[PDB]
Amino acid sequence: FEEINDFETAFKRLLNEVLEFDLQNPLKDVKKVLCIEPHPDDCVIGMGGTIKRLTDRGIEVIYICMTDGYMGTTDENITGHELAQIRRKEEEESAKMLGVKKIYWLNYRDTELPYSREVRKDLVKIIRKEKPDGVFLPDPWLPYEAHPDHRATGFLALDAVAFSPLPNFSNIDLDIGLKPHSVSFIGLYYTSRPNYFVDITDVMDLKLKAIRAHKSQFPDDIWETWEPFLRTVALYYGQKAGVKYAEGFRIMPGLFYHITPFAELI
Amino acid sequence: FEEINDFETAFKRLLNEVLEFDLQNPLKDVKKVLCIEPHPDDCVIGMGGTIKRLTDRGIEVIYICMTDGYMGTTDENITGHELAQIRRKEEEESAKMLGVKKIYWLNYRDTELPYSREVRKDLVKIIRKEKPDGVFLPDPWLPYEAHPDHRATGFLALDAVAFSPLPNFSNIDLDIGLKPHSVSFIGLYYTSRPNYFVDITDVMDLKLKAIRAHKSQFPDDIWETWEPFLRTVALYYGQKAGVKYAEGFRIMPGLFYHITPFAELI
Amino acid sequence: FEEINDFETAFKRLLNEVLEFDLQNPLKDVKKVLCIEPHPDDCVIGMGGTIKRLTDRGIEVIYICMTDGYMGTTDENITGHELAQIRRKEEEESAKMLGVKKIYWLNYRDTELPYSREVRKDLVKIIRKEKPDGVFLPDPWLPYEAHPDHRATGFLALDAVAFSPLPNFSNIDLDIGLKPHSVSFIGLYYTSRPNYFVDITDVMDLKLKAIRAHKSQFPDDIWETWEPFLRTVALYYGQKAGVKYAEGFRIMPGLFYHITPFAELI
Amino acid sequence: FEEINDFETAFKRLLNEVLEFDLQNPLKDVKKVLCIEPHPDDCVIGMGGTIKRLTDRGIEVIYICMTDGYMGTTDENITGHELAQIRRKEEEESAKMLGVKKIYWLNYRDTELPYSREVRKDLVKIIRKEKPDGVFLPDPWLPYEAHPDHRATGFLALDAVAFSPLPNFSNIDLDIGLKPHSVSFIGLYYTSRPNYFVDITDVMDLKLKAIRAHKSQFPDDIWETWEPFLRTVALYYGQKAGVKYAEGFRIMPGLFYHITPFAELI
Amino acid sequence: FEEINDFETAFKRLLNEVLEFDLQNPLKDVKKVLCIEPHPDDCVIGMGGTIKRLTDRGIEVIYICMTDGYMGTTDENITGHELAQIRRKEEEESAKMLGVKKIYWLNYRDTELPYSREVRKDLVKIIRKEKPDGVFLPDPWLPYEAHPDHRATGFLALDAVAFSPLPNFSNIDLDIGLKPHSVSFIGLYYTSRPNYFVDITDVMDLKLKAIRAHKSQFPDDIWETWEPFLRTVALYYGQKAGVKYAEGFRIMPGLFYHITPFAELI
Amino acid sequence: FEEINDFETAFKRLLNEVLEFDLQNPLKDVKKVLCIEPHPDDCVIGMGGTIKRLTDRGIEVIYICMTDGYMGTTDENITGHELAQIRRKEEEESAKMLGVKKIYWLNYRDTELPYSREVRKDLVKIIRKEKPDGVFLPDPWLPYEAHPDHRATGFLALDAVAFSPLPNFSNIDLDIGLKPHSVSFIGLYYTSRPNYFVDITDVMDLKLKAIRAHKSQFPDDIWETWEPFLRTVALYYGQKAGVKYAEGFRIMPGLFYHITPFAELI
Ligand SMILES: [Cl-]
Ligand SMILES: [Cl-]
Ligand SMILES: [Cl-]
Ligand SMILES: [Cl-]
Ligand SMILES: [Zn+2]
Ligand SMILES: [Zn+2]
Ligand SMILES: [Zn+2]
Ligand SMILES: [Zn+2]
Ligand SMILES: [Zn+2]
Ligand SMILES: [Zn+2]
Q1: How many contacts, defined by CB atoms under 8 Å, are there between D and E?
Q2: Which positions bind Zn(2+) 2 (chains A, B, C, D, E, F) (predicted)?
């Protein structure tokens, strides 16, 4: 590689020959994935269509939900305890409509999710137990994301995936018979720099039915705003992918999440 | 909205019809605003002109100052306790010169402002009490902002505004008779992605006199650097707005601060 | 400066006359610098070539390593305690090969570096003791940096530099006879927005030998991936600087790290 | 007082003349008290009889409950969210049976109550709003108390009472129009060093009915153990007070909670 | 129990009939116990003899060590990383000499053991996996215990035992197939209020050989002080039990660790 | 020591021969001591008399004050910043009246002193710099001490003394040329289990003048209560020592602060 005198060549060779990074079929071998959502309803809102598509193709999809959704209401007659119970039933209904069979609830309180070692260990435990091929998580670099649970979940999910294979990390996991694990695939959903698209034209009406199942979050008057907003998001991704309705994801080789100044160039 | 096949149309309709988002007069009905500053002098440096303009138009402007300014000196003869006392008198003088009548001091120590639930609750209490129509806060995504108190204040102010209307958030506030509150208007000051401008050509000399009132922060020799820097900032904003001297703000609909991949497009 | 009617003029004058900012020879008077690395091997990987060039020019280079490298292995036979010992010897060998004489080990555990006042005070102590002219640190705004130790180190280094000269900050340092200190020079390594380059075509094979000295981190099979990745990075910086192999740095005047909306413009 | 040469005399004079400390009728003027409980059911279990006696005498009793009781079950079919909802209804029933009209729920999670400034501020807010004459709280020095929520509540309640009257403590409370407040009376319940007793012979069957109202906590099989345990506690206090069934409290002058080496002598 | 009019009767019946509390053989059915030690060497120093006695009787003894022993040296030539490696080998040798076959290392750093939910979860995981009949832990109420790791370990071990059987506590443990678990037996070692004794006259020379195996901690000159100190401790316990050399333990019914004012009476 | 068959003998030998523990003159070689106080005025109130006696005997006494005294007023007209300034001047006057030359201010805020590694390191730095022979600190086991700053200071002081001599603890101190340090002498003031007394009948009126110097803390009406309280405390210690007025201290050999079940027996 000392032979090479020009960046684009080196870059092309690094990606294509050295890393063998494929953006055309990057879910080739994947049989099990984790979707990590900050609140009940985030998996379905950000990639509900893709989830349905994967379950139909007989890929096993497992949700990890970081919080209980305790705060998500303006109704003074509903306690956070009542609302958590409700949003558990709602995500159970929603997850059944897409093919999703298992949900792990971390049960950190909505608005109170720590960026801490503790939460890294909670995720690394599940990854080591379920040995998934791929993990989906919200992009922590989404510009203007003011929800701290969202930002946190992103960094934690990356940290967890990064540390799952390190046997000195959360070592009691090994001592009780969980083996360390490398994930093959990482995809960021809720991203503004997607580089992989999935047509959801055919499943858009199911996706919206699975979102609406979260009745607590979507009364008629809120739905007036959110059905348009969601169709607009699907068109934004759609236009880039040459279809009506798409879901955007950012997929990179693991190496590019660390000390890569040209990471923004894929 | 199923009717729509292209993004730009959907985008235009979302902004114009669904959200009714106005960049021509977004302060229409605003009678009271909060300006949140990390240190004494930040409201005046970032939007002192706009504050004067608002008070002249008979709009009530209330400062929330996050810290005491304990660290802001190189003089070995001044203790942090002395400096805090001084910077309280300075901001009191400065605030009088602009039309500003109330300041809340959180009194967290300069350089030690936590990114915590506690501080969210301190802000949400004031918002519920003062029921402001609009809130101004420093842009936390300002590139190359190395002051941790600045970054923190931005995220906290957004969190506070987002959570003020949720009755299960800091619920003791309700139990002692503070009602939940929605803010109509959010504006980010100290931003590099402004999309709303205020002419301060006419109030620039008052703005500089109100900055200079912070004598502790601005001895003659420091002022040699800072009067130029401030004129340059006002020109940068000015050029974009077609005037000599402007203050820039980023204003978006509340919806766009959460899971909006096209947020950077306004 | 009231005279000026256009931004670009004011900008040019602010940079050239007021701030005297020089990008052609910014290491004029620099005799002593600190290189702050999150892990053992980060100084060598991010600016090993530049460090050699500085040593040869008789500039004193001191490493501060934030963590012990406890987690950096997939081998189930190596404890984090064994690995820390090993990576100490490796960085000692690597530091010998470049001209580096002194290493401070903070010994926070890999993956567990706090963003806290405590760690700010640990750095400020070293800066006040060594009174360095310049500090190098990894760019905390590097896009897609998922390693929390990296993000943390960047913000802490800037905080430390900013607070070293404040006598009310960590005041016990003064009480035991460490004087406050201003550093002249700040340079961000591992950056995607570099604006200063150093030719390392001549030292590239030494740099790779000094990286390979970290045997724990770079077995044959991993080096198949990392020798290409590093040549590609050096070309990326190289293309921008018009040479084969360069190391990129971002250098700005201290003022631009605070409330500067045109900071992105240098 | 320089006249005095013997401790017992000075001690007697300090208590009787200087402090005017009365153990015979120490609730003389009290019209409003707060009972602070770590979990739902702690007020009723530790002093349910005394509460009834006070409400019958037309004294206003307000509960502050620190936690939600999320963890208090071995039943794998009940979520912490369900159980919190349930224990809210149970304490509402229980509190109605005794004369208690108002409950504030802090809603910190069972087993997760922090010993933090935040929680001190939550209590000081309620004290300043309700201006109670007296506060009851569990004795933090109860030997062999392994429940961390119990230990925590005790220290926090004392801290809160101590800091309620300090206008520089949680100063935003004052800024929104809560005046500082001194409590006249402090009583520790769940104590092993009681020095004031209340006959509950006449209300013991109501106390047990109000405990049993917490059905979640007291199934038939658990009640086999807890009816005896509670009768035994009431006899232990009873024997000391010369009655069948009593509730023990430790009452001291505020001064004795700080730097008093003979505090254990009342 | 309404029948009873005097405490001593009720107390006797509570202990003997209701709780069936046995101080003659409280290890009756115990096949597996956990010994929790703050540092390498604490299990052997506090109850090494008892451990030997248990392994000879074919009872399975598992150590949980909370910290790595990083700080335990005055030798400036030994890093904390070197010392941890050493103290791992030492406790492995020591544990072999007593019958002990499993050690779990939490690897929190010596002097830095947090009193946190995280550490509770680490212990509860091991308890649920190993389903021990009994747990030994240092008495957190030991007067004049200044080592914060000691105090912490005590409270944490009690918390862990208390919370192991609650399915809503660390619920991910259940989701990955660890069942909740109740411990039958709790014994506090390093206690000044022991109420159960074990003769170690016959195993005292093995106990001292197993202590001495921690060479790092016990050079000749330190052993001059510690062999006497240990013989003195064994006599103190011995005198109370009517033997030369004993190890003291405090054993109570689980009920007495919560809201029991007469707990100090057994 | 195998020879010995009885505890009291072993105990006597351990104390007298092995540990050489002297309660008759335990300040033999002491030339320099630290007095650690949680608030300004705690050294003077707890051992002001003893301090004068030590100064007169030409022993160097250095105050470490943990907090700034920010909260200590009921006056709504005084800010915590004003009060800290004032209490600095007051402790400077008070310290002059006794022979005290040097005060280190940690400047943690009153009511907000952390029990953290950070604060341990702040104390260990001062101890290593001043190499004192002895340290005085408030007894953290003082029954009914409700002030969290007091409890915290005690544990921190002991931790600091324990860890000062460990070169792997706060190792950057060594890297900047502070040597590790063992203190010879530890004495607990504000204790209810004193075992060493100092006659202060001769200095009692100076002690009261040095307390009264803290005017902020002691207006006429408060002094009506505090002059009696202090005379009573001095008599309590006095009676035990067979004098009118004494100051009590608890002194033990360093070994007894760790795993010593008979520590209560001296
Ligand atoms: Cl662990
Ligand atoms: Cl497709
Ligand atoms: Cl506050
Ligand atoms: Cl009565
Ligand atoms: Zn969400
Ligand atoms: Zn600022
Ligand atoms: Zn690194
Ligand atoms: Zn309870
Ligand atoms: Zn230990
Ligand atoms: Zn005090």
Answers
A1: 111
A2: 181
In the block, tokens 């609830």 appear at: A105
Ordered DSSP codes for chain D: -TT---HHHHHHHIIIIIS---SSSTTSS--EEEEEESSTTHHHHHHHHHHHHHHHTT-EEEEEEEE--TT----TTS-HHHHHHHHHHHHHHHHHHTT--EEEEEEE-TT----SHHHHHHHHHHHHHH--SEEEEE-TT-TT---HHHHHHHHHHHHHHHHTT-TTSSTHHHHTTPPP---SEEEEES-SS--EEEE-TTTHHHHHHHHHT-GGG--HHHHHHHHHHHHHHHHHHHHHHTSSSEEEEB---GGGGSS-TTGGG-
Neighbouring chains of C at 3+ CB pairs within 8 Å? Answer: A, B, E, F
CA nearest to F170 within chain E: E71
Number of Cβ atoms within 10 Å of the Cβ of D245: 24
Resolution (A): 2.8
Torsion sign over Cα C200, C201, C202, C205: positive
Selected for mutation to probe chain A from C155, C232, C243 (highest A CB count within 10 Å) is: C232
In C95-112, which positions are buried (b, 16+ CB within 10 angstroms) versus exposed (e)?
bebbbbeebbbbbbbbbb
Chain B residues within 8 A of F81 when measuring between CB atoms: 68, 81-82, 84-85, 88
Q: State the Cα–Cα distance between residues A4 and A6, nearest whole angstrom.
A: 6
Distance from CA of F21 to the nearest CA of B (A): 44
Which tokens belong to D235? 């006899």
- Distance (Å, whole) CA B187 – CA B133: 12
What residues of B are in contact with residue F80 (Cβ under 8 Å)?
107
Sign of CA dihedral B62, B68, B72, B74: positive
Q: State the sign of the Cα–Cα–Cα–Cα dihedral E157, E160, E164, E170.
A: negative
First to last CA, chain C: 21
Crossing angle for the helix pair B204-212 and B80-97, to the nearest 10 degrees:
160
Token couple for E9: 């009767």
Give the distance (Å) from ligand 8 centre to CA of residue D214. Answer: 12
Contact list, B125 vs chain D (CB under 8 Å): 172, 176
| Neighbours, chain A (3 or more CB pairs < 8 A) | B, C, D, E
**Which alpha helices (H) appear in B145-219, and where do they start and end?**
148-163, 172-175, 204-212
Beta bridge partners of C234: none
Taking residue F18's Cβ as centre, other Cβ atoms within 10 Å add up to 19
What sign does the dihedral B208-B210-B216-B217 (CA atoms) show? negative
Q: Is B105's Cβ below 8 Å from some Cβ in D?
A: yes
Q: What is the F38 CA–ligand 10 centroid distance (Å)? A: 5
Residue with tokens 């601005």: B218
The answer to whether C88 contacts chain E (CB < 8 Å) is: yes
Question: For residue E3, what are the contacts with CB-CB under 8 A and spacing of at least 6?
Answer: none
Residue ranges of the binding site of E for Zn(2+): 39, 42, 150, 181, 220
Residue type present at position D182: S
Q: Is B154 helix (H, G, I), strand (E, B) or coil?
A: helix
**Residue with token string 């009583």:** D187
**Residues F119 and F156: beta-carbon distance below 8 Å:** yes
- Give the one of A104, A126, A172 whose C-beta lies nearest to E122's C-beta: A172
In sequence order, which residues have a C-beta less than 8 Å from that of residue B133 and are 6 or more positions away? B29, B30, B31, B32, B33, B183, B184, B185
Residue of C nearest to F65 (CA): C172
d(CA F198, CA F237) in angstroms, rounded, equals 9
d(CA D15, CA D251): 13
C198: distance to nearest CA of chain B, Å? 22
DSSP notation for D125-184:
HHHHHH--SEEEEE-TT-TT---HHHHHHHHHHHHHHHHTT-TTSSTHHHHTTPPP---S
